[PDB]
Amino acid sequence: PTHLSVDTKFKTEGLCVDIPGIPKDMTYRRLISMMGFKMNYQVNGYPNMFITREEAIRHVRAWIGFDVEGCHGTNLPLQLGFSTGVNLVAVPTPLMYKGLPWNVVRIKIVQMLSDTLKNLSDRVVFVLWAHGFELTSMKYFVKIGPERTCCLCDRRATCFSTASDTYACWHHSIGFDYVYNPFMIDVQQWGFTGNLQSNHDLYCQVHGNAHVASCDAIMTRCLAVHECFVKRVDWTIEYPIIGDELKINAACRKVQHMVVKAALLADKFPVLHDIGNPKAIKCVPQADVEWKFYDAQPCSDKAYKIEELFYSYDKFTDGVCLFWNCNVDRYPANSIVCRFDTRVLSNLNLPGCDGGSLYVNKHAFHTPAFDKSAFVNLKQLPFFYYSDSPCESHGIDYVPLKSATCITRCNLGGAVCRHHANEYRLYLDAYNMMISAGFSLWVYKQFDTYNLWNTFT
Numbered sequence: 001p002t003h004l005s006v007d008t009k010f011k012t013e014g015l016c017v018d019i020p021g022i023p024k025d026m027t028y029r030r031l032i033s034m035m036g037f038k039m040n041y042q043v044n045g046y047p048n049m050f051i052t053r054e055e056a057i058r059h060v061r062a063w064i065g066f067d068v069e070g071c072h073g074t075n076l077p078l079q080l081g082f083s084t085g086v087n088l089v090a091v092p093t094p095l096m097y098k099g100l101p102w103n104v105v106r107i108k109i110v111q112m113l114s115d116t117l118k119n120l121s122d123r124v125v126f127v128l129w130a131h132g133f134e135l136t137s138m139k140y141f142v143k144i145g146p147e148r149t150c151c152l153c154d155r156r157a158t159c160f161s162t163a164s165d166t167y168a169c170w171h172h173s174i175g176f177d178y179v180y181n182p183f184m185i186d187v188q189q190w191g192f193t194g195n196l197q198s199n200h201d202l203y204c205q206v207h208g209n210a211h212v213a214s215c216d217a218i219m220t221r222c223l224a225v226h227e228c229f230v231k232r233v234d235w236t237i238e239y240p241i242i243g244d245e246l247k248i249n250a251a252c253r254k255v256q257h258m259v260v261k262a263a264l265l266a267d268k269f270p271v272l273h274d275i276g277n278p279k280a281i282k283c284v285p286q287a288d289v290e291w292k293f294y295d296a297q298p299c300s301d302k303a304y305k306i307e308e309l310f311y312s313y314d315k316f317t318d319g320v321c322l323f324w325n326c327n328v329d330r331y332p333a334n335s336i337v338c339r340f341d342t343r344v345l346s347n348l349n350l351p352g353c354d355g356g357s358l359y360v361n362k363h364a365f366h367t368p369a370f371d372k373s374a375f376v377n378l379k380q381l382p383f384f385y386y387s388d389s390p391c392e393s394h395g396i397d398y399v400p401l402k403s404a405t406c407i408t409r410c411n412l413g414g415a416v417c418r419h420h421a422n423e424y425r426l427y428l429d430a431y432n433m434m435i436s437a438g439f440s441l442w443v444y445k446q447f448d449t450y451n452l453w454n455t456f457t
């Protein structure tokens, strides 16, 4: 059971207002045929246009919500809405475009999907709340057949051009007019009571219903993200590397060791309460401190309430609390915090449910909306580099470093050595990588790097 059987049953009740008289008994095979496509008994990598919830989850980066609303349908104009906020009007002859024939609408669809998806995925998954018009409109912009490769590269073909009779991936599709071998999933097949807006609004207050097709496309995809990543969580699914995943993760580990090490050296807390991932390891193994761990999985729905995390019966007020990606409603004043900023624009961060974002880096993590009020008892952690390692080069040309934030014995002594200058510049690069990936760093108000200078005596 790798792919979705074309002989699987498809519930058609949601389709009968646009398509009156639709048979109750229906398979994906008959549905695809009714959509004007022909599968021709082809065992060439594309067994079905529709996919399972499990395949959809593995391909979350390819998700594009799609809705079609009849403005007046062979005789009537259709409004094509996508979760990118785009609305196109197709004539049979929140960005709104005026009525145009299918031959030009299809060119815009290819361009839009290609720019959105080229750095996210090898495919497109149309996420629907199917009522009929969206399925019957696909024949005007989609072509299907065997799996193919790009004419200019080795990636799989996602587009076709009738002008040159060629196939292309999302990176090489300029001027292509057809979407080739797209995938799709109907959210209505998952068993819901009531319409799209009533199910979406149960969990999300950030997406409204401005009554246009793109609003429904956005609500549709958001509801699918809620079901697959908020209410259901699977950390055993691995996602491919598409960007700076490894550098970002390495940078996070470097910054954590640095910040926690200097907080312990500057304020000498007797105990550190490490709250978060139950698989955490001490980030400063040589530190004197009493290291105590508290297990909390990443919260994917709402931030943890500090009262439920700390109360219900031990002394968190003693020493310092470390919340490394442990999203709480209000941090205590004695904290060291790393909190992901859901508003960050990146190829790793996908739009999520109710202000949250879906951060995909090896695993998918739905993260509650970033809230500046969580950090009221703390301040932003300033950049700094600290090193007690000896000044000794060993073993990439040089320019002398001058910086008030290079906290080393050589800078204290008046002149930064080559070793600490190379290490500072590498650390600053890792730091900038982590911040630009969306991570934010917060610290207890008494934290002062001036206290690190006397750790060299």
Ligand SMILES: COCC(=O)Nc1c(C)cc(C)cc1C
Pocket: 275, 294, 308, 309, 310, 311, 312, 313, 314
């Ligand atoms: C970060 O979590 C703080 C906290 O309250 N943890 C805790 C729990 C949950 C149960 C018992 C019996 C004891 C403690 C210290």
Ligand SMILES: COCC(=O)Nc1c(C)cc(C)cc1C
Pocket: 267, 316, 317, 318, 333, 334, 335, 444, 446
């Ligand atoms: C409950 O924690 C109260 C608090 O603010 N603790 C604190 C103290 C007392 C001294 C230093 C230098 C730093 C911290 C974080």
Ligand SMILES: [Zn+2]
Pocket: 150, 151, 152, 153, 154, 155, 168, 169, 170, 171, 172
């Ligand atoms: Zn290509």
Ligand SMILES: [Zn+2]
Pocket: 200, 204, 205, 206, 207, 218, 219, 222, 223, 352, 353, 354
């Ligand atoms: Zn929503």
Ligand SMILES: [Zn+2]
Pocket: 390, 391, 392, 408, 409, 410, 411, 416, 417, 418, 419, 420
């Ligand atoms: Zn040095």
